[PDB]
Symmetry: D5
């Protein structure tokens, strides 16, 4: 597919299950002006997937409080989504959700983000960070049996915000409050001494 | 490029700067039987890059002790690498290294991992986790101004090792010692009670 | 797609939800020697679909008693199927099933039977009658809002069986016990006096 | 051929034998505003075919009374049609007809409906339900030795009319007077508890 | 099409209505060793056509007695042929036939003799004279409204036979018993004195 | 070549030997408004050919009197034609001619009427009847050793003229004064009874 | 065409009119071991052409005495050739011939010698000198209205023979008995002094 | 190459050595209104070539006096030409020249006249006669060891001039003062009586 | 690549390390009106390369004083360049530079000058002399182990300036003050007497 | 063309003027085991060219004594070469030569070394250094008006010989007896200090 860093994120406009239980088209352009964490998962009613989806749903506010939305997506229909929502978490369900979930029934969205597993018809665990101008800035794809880390997605969004705001550059392992540096041969000396 | 999850990692055999200061060809097939974290950076003598490279070098043992090697790569010559190694960390140098650094002068390696930034001739911050059978299992690419997290690379390697060892599946945010589950509708019920 | 009357039905070998609740590959060649009614529906957890699926499941024996199996198929995963099976009929579920249901996640089966609705990613209400030599003998496709008739499927299977057994031809509206005729200019005269 | 559900039915304008014994061009666009049942048969002066053609002719009014026309078609010339019309039913003829019969001498119409049997030069038993906007809504194709059912064609036309009139969806085996349901997760509950 | 003088006549093997009222495949190679007059007509149950077909049937013996068979062909089915045969001549029928009539339902035979009228799907009035080695020696094609002349076909066959037998050449308007000449500058002088 | 019935005859404009012994271009469009019999022969100074050419020359008037011209054509130059004209008939010459003879030295005309015998560079005995609108209505091609019949050409022209004038159709063997019929199922009955 | 100096002359094998009035195939390979003057002319029964043909025929012996044959060729048939031969020279005929004349009816020979005038279908006045190994050594082509010179053809053949025999080179205007020179910088000095 | 009789001679515009010892571009269009004899030779400082070149130079006036120029051409540079001009004839030089000599260093001119000997990079002894409208009228090409005849070139130019002036045609061996004839069947008879 | 003599030098506009230690785009068009010596070297921090670069830097003024700039280029980044500049010459560094050094990180500039060594990703020792109209006048490429000569580059620039100023031509080994000659057959004689 | 550094030099086998005044084929493979300086010049009888050719001829021994041959080449014929050799140096000639000179009449050799000036048909001043294994090691091409330097060619050959013999690398301006260095980061320090 079609997703390249520092190019416009592949556009989409697709039916999604909204937090209030309704079906509505969600378009990438509706997130213009915001950061977006778009993430894919393979299949409704499975195993790693609800742990990830529920973690992002429970913690949406950590993202919304810094101007970042989150959006989930899989191959399943809206109706599968809705049904999965109607089962309690203790039975492997989702319960109530605070994030929308796209139903990529044609699989065109996952194809364009380059995360289709062709042999099975499902998405790999791709996560993408899209900025307010709608350009792609970070790509993460896990094989199916290993879940992603929500704290790391949050760290990345924060690091990217920081870079836009201050024109500085974020070192390895950067967390809010750590030292950063200007990407300049002379001014960077301040970072490297002590 | 042609790096796809669960397919053989694109093969390479290229000159590298070795820890002992010599130049030697390093071939992907040398790592057969081990896990490998292969990571790219844009340019010698810059800013984020030495913070990442030095972190992975300082912490190699955390990776070796669990059967995982680490390898770095950039567009620069082996002579640039060596020179950079000869400058102290407090002046923006690398100092002594415990990991090899490939010199991808033809750029064929970064092209094949899909992390060339064509307009500039440099690699994005791509990091790849390759398993002992030499298949690619995890892809991570950051835009240039935001550094990667070594603790997260380690978590992922561990999670993948855990999955291969026990046939179980690793939930969101999994750290060694957390609960896992069997990817089966019936047996997964045990997990969803907690 | 490539489903043509009197040619071999397009071959498939895909995961299915079996009546006993397990997952197993079901291959077209496993029905060699039997008649098969293969039928597609658009989406799990919807409206016309369970009324059809349940009718075929309740009445399997009418088909099995005369050497004819029945097989259902949709775009949804095995896991969606299983979940739907776990909801009671009076809540729009399937309950226990006596028929397998294929999970055509790659959509290759529906593509090959020519019943994909490309814009939505779902199958039209296609029903196919395949004979013991595995050749396709009857094609039926409804638009989504109108359900199929199980009595008419049964009539067709019986008519095709009757034709293979006796070398006669089945007139319009034929039911078991009605007059048939030999497809011969002279011998047909008997039928037409009436 | 190119007959697809919910696309415009393939257009035609061809010589037909009319009920009054004359020859006239009949164009698909003449049926705009009506439902149309278009049906093909292999050969004049054969066996299943007159039983089907006569049934549809005898019962045209059941179709006209509900705003649906019927049209027949085969590979034979107008002159064969006319001749067949001049033989009495008890000798295997058609007698007087109340429906037109197209003479698809070039075979372009059957090609475009996808019901040509290339090896023999004849049409399979294809039956198509076209709506007033001239979109195709139902496809039925039988192998040659098994006739179609007129009552089932009628049921389908009625079901489709019912759906257009009321915005409801017709379950399996639906006949006029049976319960229907709204294709909505919440409003469909009324159907399933009763 | 590909009928060329002095090349093998395009081969065919097709269902025909035989004089005795049965259906049988007739193959061009059956006529090896004989002369053949193959002739096409547009449509069963029409106007010029029966006058030609009946003339050739009545007069077959004039052709058989000199080692020449005759074969008719049209686009219509065997069943049309048979039906037409069952109507008396005074009602525009054929009555009993002494020649076989091919049913070129796929139209492949007329295509290959180059006498298809594409717009209508029917054959022009093509007549072809094929020799015992199965090479084509004479081509005649009339537009539909003008019938052919049987006496002229007979003249041509006789002329061609005469030429094979004696190595002489047949002048304009030659009839049995007229002067012929050797195709030699010197020996032809005998003809031209008269 | 590209001569097809009911299509414009292939156009030509070529040097011809005129009756008065001169050379002039003769163009197909010159014959607009007339019937034309165009006929080809293989070679000047040969055997069948002068018998045909002389017969058509002697009898031109039978054709002119009914609005039909005649034109001859061969591969030879105008100078060969002229020379052949200068030899008396009793020595195998043509003598004085009342018809023009085209000199198709490039062979483009015979190629386009489809009567070139490629291996020898000469025309077969092709004869074509072109109507006043310049459409081709009748094709006749004989192998070289058998001459054509002038009376039959005349019969055909007359039959075609008769059909244009009266809208009737000419049966097998029709001669002026024989019964004809209207090509209509009802009105044709009068021909077939008595 | 394909006639190139010092390459094999384009091969031919075609019907010719022989001196004794018979028709025979003449093949280029028949002249192996001899010199050959092959010459083309546009049309039998014309103007320049017989003056050339008759000159070469009258003077054959001047050529045959030095091991050189001569062969003529045009677009006309053998029968035109023969006829032209039968007219006396004083009436523009050829009379008796001592050279064969090819009849290049397909025009393949003139095409291959590159002397076809496409617009007219005739050969230009091409004359070719072919040596005993069958390689082409001299090309001469005149526009139609200017005849060739026989004495010059003879001079050329003699010059080429002289060159084969002695390994010397023939100056401008060379005639038998004139000075020649060795094609060597030193030995050529003898020619250039006195 | 693309030199064809009666087509425009291939155009050229190339450096030449002029008679006065200077270098100047000579363009074919400069000769418009004149006859031109263009002749090629293989190599400066060789053997046959100076005998030809010197003959044409010595006898230019025989050509100029009748409105015909002459132009020479070879693969050699203008400097080779000049040098050759500086050596006396008695040592194999050219001496003073009255004719320009083109230096076809790119070989494009000889390629276009079709007289390149590809294996050696030199021109064959091609001579071409171009008329005042710049059309090619006569082609002569000799293999390298045999020189051309200047008298024959002159004869040809004269013959062509004669034909353009009087509309008559020049027989074999024609010299000024010989009988010519009108190219007309009737008027040519006067030539053939003698 | 596409560098050809007397064609425009391939255009470039690329980041360079300037003498004052800054990074700036340098475009070929900046040198319009000057002579330019553009020279490539394989790799920063190597062996031959600094001896060449330092020689050209030390001696820039010898080039500037005569209207000629000099520009260096390699595959390495601007940061490698800057670093190399920061090491003293006696440790293998460059020290302060008086010439800019391009950083051809995409390798597009070396590709277009045809000096890429594809297998290694580095430039050969290519040196190019570009004139004030920006046309390429001199190409020099050494294999990697042999350095170029600065005095030769200077000699060439001077020779080319001399030629442009005086319209004379520079002999083998020419140094300022040596004899030159006019490129004219006559005027060159003065040079060759000595 | 296809001359590339460190690839086999383009092969040739062509007529040359040898030192003793004879013509002989000279093949590149004859120089296997020796160094070769191959050099091209534009045109015999010109201006810079003899100064270069004479200077290489006078100084051949400086090259032979160190195992290096020299070979010259131009577009002109052997005969031009020989002639130029016959003129004394004081008149712009070559006199006696000690070096062979190829006559690249087809221009295939200069094409393959990439030094053809297509518009003029002549070679640029290309000079190539080929090693004993026949690989190309140095390319030099001057525009026409500036001659090359023989001392620099000699310097280069010596430098390349030195490098092959000792495995060291030759700095800028290296002359026999100057300091060289080992191409190793550590061992090169000896060169850079003092």
């Amino acid at each position: 597919g079609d997703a390249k860093l520092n190019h416009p994120a592949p556009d989409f406009n697709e039916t999604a299950l909204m937090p209030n239980g309704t079906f509505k088209k969600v378009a990438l352009t509706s997130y213009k002006g915001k950061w977006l964490v778009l993430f894919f998962y393979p299949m409704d009613f499975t195993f790693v997937c609800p742990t990830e989806i529920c973690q992002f749903s429970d913690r949406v506010k950590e993202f919304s409080d810094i101007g970042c939305e989150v959006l989930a997506c899989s191959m399943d229909s809206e109706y599968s989504h809705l049904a999965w929502t109607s089962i309690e978490r203790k039975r492997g369900g989702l319960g109530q959700m605070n994030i929308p979930i796209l139903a990529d029934k044609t699989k065109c969205i996952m194809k364009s983000y380059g995360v289709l597993k062709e042999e099975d018809g499902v998405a790999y665990r791709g996560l993408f960070i899209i900025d307010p101008k709608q350009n792609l800035r970070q790509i993460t794809v896990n094989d199916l049996p290993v879940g992603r880390d929500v704290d790391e997605a949050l760290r990345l969004v924060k690091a990217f915000q920081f870079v836009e705001k201050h024109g500085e550059v974020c070192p390895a392992n950067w967390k809010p409050g750590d030292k950063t540096m200007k990407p300049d041969p002379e001014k960077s000396k301040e970072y490297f001494g002590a």
